[PDB]
Design a protein around this ligand. Sequence first.
Ligand SMILES: C[C@H]1CCC[C@H](O)CCC/C=C/c2cc(O)cc(O)c2C(=O)O1
Ligand SMILES: C[C@H]1CCC[C@H](O)CCC/C=C/c2cc(O)cc(O)c2C(=O)O1
Lengths: 264, 264
Amino acid sequence: MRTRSTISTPNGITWYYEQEGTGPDVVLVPDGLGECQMFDSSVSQIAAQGFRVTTFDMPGMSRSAKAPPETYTEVTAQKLASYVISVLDALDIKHATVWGCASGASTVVALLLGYPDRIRNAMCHELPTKLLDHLSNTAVLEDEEISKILANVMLNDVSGGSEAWQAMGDEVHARLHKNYPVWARGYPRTIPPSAPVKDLEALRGKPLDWTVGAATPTESFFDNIVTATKAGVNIGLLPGMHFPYVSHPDVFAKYVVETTQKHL
Amino acid sequence: MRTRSTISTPNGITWYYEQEGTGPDVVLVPDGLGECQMFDSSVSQIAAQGFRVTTFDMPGMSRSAKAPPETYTEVTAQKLASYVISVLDALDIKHATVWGCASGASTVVALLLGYPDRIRNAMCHELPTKLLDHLSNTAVLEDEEISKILANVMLNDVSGGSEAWQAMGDEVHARLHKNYPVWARGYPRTIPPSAPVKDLEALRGKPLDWTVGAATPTESFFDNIVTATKAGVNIGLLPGMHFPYVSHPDVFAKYVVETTQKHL
Ligand SMILES: C[C@H]1CCC[C@H](O)CCC/C=C/c2cc(O)cc(O)c2C(=O)O1
Ligand SMILES: C[C@H]1CCC[C@H](O)CCC/C=C/c2cc(O)cc(O)c2C(=O)O1
């Protein structure tokens, strides 16, 4: 039985969250678009090994839109990590395995470095380190135009699995539509300079497992592979591209349970 | 004026070779398909910055087909390296910068390690280190069936630049047609286990500059990035995928001259 509910933290945010299972805590942090329906299948799968899976829409996005604008403007890994630690406190999750991709990747590594006693271990996927003008220049377009462009970027380039993407259904895509603009204005300019990955030595030794999409063009996260390898951090691949939990749930959920298990 | 000619070495091979310019020697080693017409524009471009550019069809391929079958069966970075040293001796090129992609990549690093006094510096691009069953399974499969399949792999997947690929013209494609089978039977099984990169400490400090295609799926040479990074070897990207000298001559030639100049 999945809990589907809301909970409020004292930084102004009213979070939509979901939760399934009994066991050590695994937390699935969404990517930029902040939409936790993307995890729905994997939540059940991971929970059926013995875990309590929690996930949530991110502040300003989908059903967690009731939040103050500092929460979704000029966003940074550090800020997102603050927010995630606040919803974790509210749900009395003391010790969590965490996953996160893209801005979620940034967020979990910043969790891992900033709050070592709270994070059993962290899985980051395709952590953004470089600015990226095609994305960034959409911020100053009108809402709606942005939605047309970003919707299309997600669909054709970057799911790694376009059928699966579309199959999320009309509701989810209606929520994403409203999300694109807030993301375009809040994330692409400011997330990458915040990357907590410039201090190689702080990564060394940490319980961190880093991945990239197998199908993703080598240029997109070449830097993740260089950085991880210099820092001794475990790195490898998942199938697809930027959303392994949409395109390849079964392998995604396997990878999460299997990696969590290593750090118990 | 380009020299277009042949020369014979005492290991049975009659090489077709080309050469343009005066200066330090830069040698362009073809990829598996062994066909040096692919360099034609770059040969001129590199030569005009003051170098003597040599290139050649590889043994058993295109216009260097008069060669004994041990030169194109059960091929191997070490073998290919001896062959290229032999055509270098015949042409009295005493010191060369070398470039190579794919099996050429394997060949140039074996040159660099085996013959340090002959190699000013080496540029390797997408070095094969894994077996690869879709390729390998073509070996047992009719000369002309293999040419259909491999011609189509090259066209659609892996030029990185399909218009440029086709524009090489019918002549070169007729030569390639005959080449695909020889390659399929001689290269994919045996080149990768010969990869001279399993000794990281031999790479360290050497004048080696390694690249991968920006557009190439991350999985294809993820390992090249790990290895280079562990060995302190210079690594980065060129545009396109597996043939940057077909798809992006101007930036290829720029990369070759600029890199040669660093070691010059
Ligand atoms: C939403 C997700 C979309 C990935 C597909 C993107 O369209 C493909 C480009 C990858 C960019 C990811 C990204 C960059 C950035 O600076 C900040 C971000 O929050 C993200 C990110 O979360 O990208
Ligand atoms: C011919 C060239 C282009 C084919 C790229 C292929 O379409 C992409 C596969 C990349 C590796 C190719 C390759 C593997 C190998 O074991 C030996 C080789 O000589 C090659 C190689 O030369 O690939």
